[PDB]
Amino acid sequence: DDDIAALVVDNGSGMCKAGFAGDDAPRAVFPSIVGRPRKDSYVGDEAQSKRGILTLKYPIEHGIVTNWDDMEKIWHHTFYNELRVAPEEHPVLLTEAPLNPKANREKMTQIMFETFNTPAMYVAIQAVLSLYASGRTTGIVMDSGDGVTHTVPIYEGYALPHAILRLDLAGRDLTDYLMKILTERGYSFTTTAEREIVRDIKEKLCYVALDFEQEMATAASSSSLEKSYELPDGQVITIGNERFRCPEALFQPSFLGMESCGIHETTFNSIMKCDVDIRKDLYANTVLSGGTTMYPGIADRMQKEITALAPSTMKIKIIAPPERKYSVWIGGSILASLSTFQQMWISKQEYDESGPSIVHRKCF
Amino acid sequence: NLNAVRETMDVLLEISRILNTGLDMETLSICVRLCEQGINPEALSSVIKELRKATEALK
Amino acid sequence: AAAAAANLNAVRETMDVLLEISRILNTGLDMETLSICVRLCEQGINPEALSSVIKELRKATEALK
Amino acid sequence: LVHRILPVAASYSAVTRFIEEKSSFEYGQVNHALAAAMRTLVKEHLILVSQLEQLHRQGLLSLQKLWFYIQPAMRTMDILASLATSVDKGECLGGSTLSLLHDRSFSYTGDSQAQELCLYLTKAASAPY
Amino acid sequence: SITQLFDDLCEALLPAANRKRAKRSLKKVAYNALFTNLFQLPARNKILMLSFDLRVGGLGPKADRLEELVEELEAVGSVLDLLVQLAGSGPPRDYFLNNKHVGRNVPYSGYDCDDLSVFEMDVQSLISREECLCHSMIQETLQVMEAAPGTGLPTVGL
Amino acid sequence: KSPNVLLQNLCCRILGRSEADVAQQFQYAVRVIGSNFAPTVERDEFLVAEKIKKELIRQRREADAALFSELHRKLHSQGVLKNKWSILYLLLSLSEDPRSYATLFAQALPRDAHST
Amino acid sequence: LRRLLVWTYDPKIRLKTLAALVDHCQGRKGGELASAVHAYTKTGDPYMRSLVQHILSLVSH
Amino acid sequence: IRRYTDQRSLDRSFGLVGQSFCAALHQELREYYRLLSVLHSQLRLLVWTYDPKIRLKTLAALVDHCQGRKGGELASAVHAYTKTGDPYMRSLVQHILSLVSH
């Protein structure tokens, strides 16, 4: 274009999403693993299936990096195997969780320009990219991703940092809670392959309805909510009534045993601790997110709860499309492509003239 | 419901023909489904004029 | 300018005379409403229609009593 | 070429004669409404030729343009002069030329230029009946 | 969903010829021009300001029709606000017009003959289009005949 | 301000209500006012003077009918208006009394002999 | 405008009508004059029907 | 074509479908009178007058083939020409087909 070829990489908790800017789909999705002998190292299906002798690790588990060796090696193996480009000839946008400390970001850009050697750089937070997918820069962004989820209020410029609420909600937590309720119920479930199969079914096949109480009464009066899953292996684990009550923590959180407040309550709590004058304008674009939109139907109950959320003063103005699983990706793919965005992008020249810490200020 | 939103689509059809808009039938059905979400209608007028300018430069 | 504001002073003088003519014949109008009535007669329209719309609107404000 | 243009003139003179002679009292109320709604279709032709008179003095009209211009009206008068021949031959009044207008409305359905003529002529002439 | 409806909108406005990389780039301006207004008093009343401008330059029954539909459209309000913005950015007879030779129970009106001059302009507009056709047939070919070979033939353009 | 939005200011001037509180009145006047944009008779400043004088003769105040001629003079001394006729035809219609026929009284030129 | 024939087409339709009431009436005054207008509004041509529906209202005042 | 369409528009026993075919023909001959007016105003221009030698070539075949047909067998000669693959001729035969099927 007029900016050298931009690349966008989001390193999640269960997969890394890499690819070139201006492509609708993620160009590549790889497992989050760096192989170590319990062979040398590998990223892919063969390494992930061989986890019991070639260790799988997580680069992120809490919204902060819990292994720096694993994250740098998954970023290097994203740049060597997932993409096979040379780093010095592409300005890259790296990802962070919203509200990560400033000195950690300084360590990140020092490492990214020195150990990695990029020509120009960006590091961005997640909800601003979901906001660029919603086609605005002002609003309240309920961002749900794999390992990082937040209700971010964001007025023009940067998010109000006093009011950003972190809530741990990811698909890994969903398949873990499905493990919990199924084994508490009495069904034999202990092995990892069965956990992989219920993670797949919770993400793809899962039923959700208008409410958990009405569908509970409907299922208790007569059972036909179970659609069979027939794999050639012969493992059949799914039941209809338990899989809609796994994300039930969005209305009443203590069904998961979570002391953190529910989705409706956290977005209500977020908009009350913003200003009352900018409340209506943020509420004129309130955003849905989460990888669980593979099955559509979650949005209808969410629209009901957003009707209940604000007092009866003005009608609901929510953006709720039934494809938002890759929202953080599609945001970056449009954002880093743009030639006007070059005036916000920071290069190596200023970076050596004014130190690393200016990447907090020039780029944000 | 689909009988009801059919008849609203017919009434919205006539008011967009006598006003001699740049839209046609199919793009009208897209924009009525779009504002059904809650998308700002002052915003959809600014995207369609610029999208129609960038498409006309190819021809 | 200065002479432009002098013209804007002179037209306010004429408009004050237009207020004076309104009150010596006893109308229900005031200056704020007359400020609309003048622009309507500037744009050109049949003034009998305007008298008719005013004589309906004054009988639609007696339903607030 | 002008011989080819003369039939729409005889398909005018018959039409304008019909309106005068068959609008007297003795011919009946239905024949009045028929001829008075035939009179309007004369009037549209008379408007045209005056605009054509303006362009001809400016040297903008010729036989090739005029031949094109009179095309939609040549079919129009051809239907009207044929109906006038029918009514006078049969000495019709009342419903005997509302049967005729009932039949002619189905007679032309494939054109939709002549179909709309007769239906308008039928709606108009049925009012006294 | 919304990220598809920008891909469907960009398809209808552009007939297929590229169309493999350009469709992705025109979806980019679909996101990029949606937010330019969002960065920087009733709804049915916005229809009435147009219905006023109808009756000013004539055609009352049309203005009665625009208001007839929006009053039954009140019983969806965010839809009409898009139509009023694209209403000046669009494209630039019969036996029944001024008739009195028809009708049954019609009151007396007498002669008018100041709209008989707007009985000749309904037909002058038709025949002035059927002459500009003849003005657009002699131009579109003389604009090619006068210019060198290459303007109507792509091959001599190679 | 455009001529259509200007009427909505009138309904909030006469009525205390907003344009949202009552719009049915504002809907009634777009139907009535929009048919024209012109007077239906050709004007003369003499006639409208002699109809306001006629009114003050009918109220037996001969001095005030000539106070008006002085107020007509200061209006002419600046002369920033040419719509003098219209606003006076308005105020004469809206006159009030602080306490027959018109088929022989001279009416304005009809424009039924003028091209319209 | 074809010697203004367009403005002189409904003329000689009004006037032929008003030369028939001025032909039928001849030294009639009284109810014989209000019979001398009757059955001139029952005409099937609507032009004459609207005009002699104006005339008889005046005569029966 | 002129002879054919003048005789069958005064012959009413050819059905009201032959007269609808004739009406469709009148529509097509009407547009050839536009071109001749333009051409009369310009008064070798070989080029302007060859593109109608493609049109009229179709027109003569269309008219000569549909002789002796009325009713649904004239719906089996205008259905003779919905078996083409050239879009100019396909557009020529449509707005004939609707009138005759009516």
Side-chain angles (χ1 to χ4, degrees), chain D residues 74-96:
Chain D
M74 192 171 283
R75 202 170 195 174
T76 303
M77 319 189 67
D78 279 20
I79 303 302
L80 317 182
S82 50
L83 187 82
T85 307
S86 67
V87 177
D88 177 38
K89 185 264 293 179
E91 301 278 313
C92 295
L93 76 162
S96 50

Side-chain angles (χ1 to χ4, degrees), chain A residues 22 135-137 321 323 334 338, chain E residues 1 4 24 32 34-35 38-39:
Chain A
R136 279 95 189 142
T137 50
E323 274 114 301
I334 192 179
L338 293 194
Chain E
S1 145
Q4 289 79 6
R24 175 57 187 159
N32 285 342
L34 190 72
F35 57 72
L38 306 157
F39 279 19

Side-chain angles (χ1 to χ4, degrees), chain E residues 8 10 31 42 49 51 56 76 80 82 113 115 134-135 148-149:
Chain E
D8 313 304
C10 85
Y31 300 117
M49 72 145 286
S51 76
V56 161
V76 309
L80 71 93
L82 179 55
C113 65
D115 71 352
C134 171
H135 294 354

Side-chain angles (χ1 to χ4, degrees), chain B residues 20-33:
Chain B
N20 196 29
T21 189
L23 308 159
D24 308 324
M25 179 49 234
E26 186 268 2
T27 58
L28 180 71
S29 78
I30 300 177
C31 72
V32 299
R33 189 172 35 240

Side-chain angles (χ1 to χ4, degrees), chain D residues 13-14 16-27:
Chain D
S13 180
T16 189
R17 275 176 304 204
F18 181 96
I19 301 166
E20 302 297 311
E21 290 100 59
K22 293 184 184 289
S23 45
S24 294
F25 292 112
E26 293 82 4
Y27 294 86

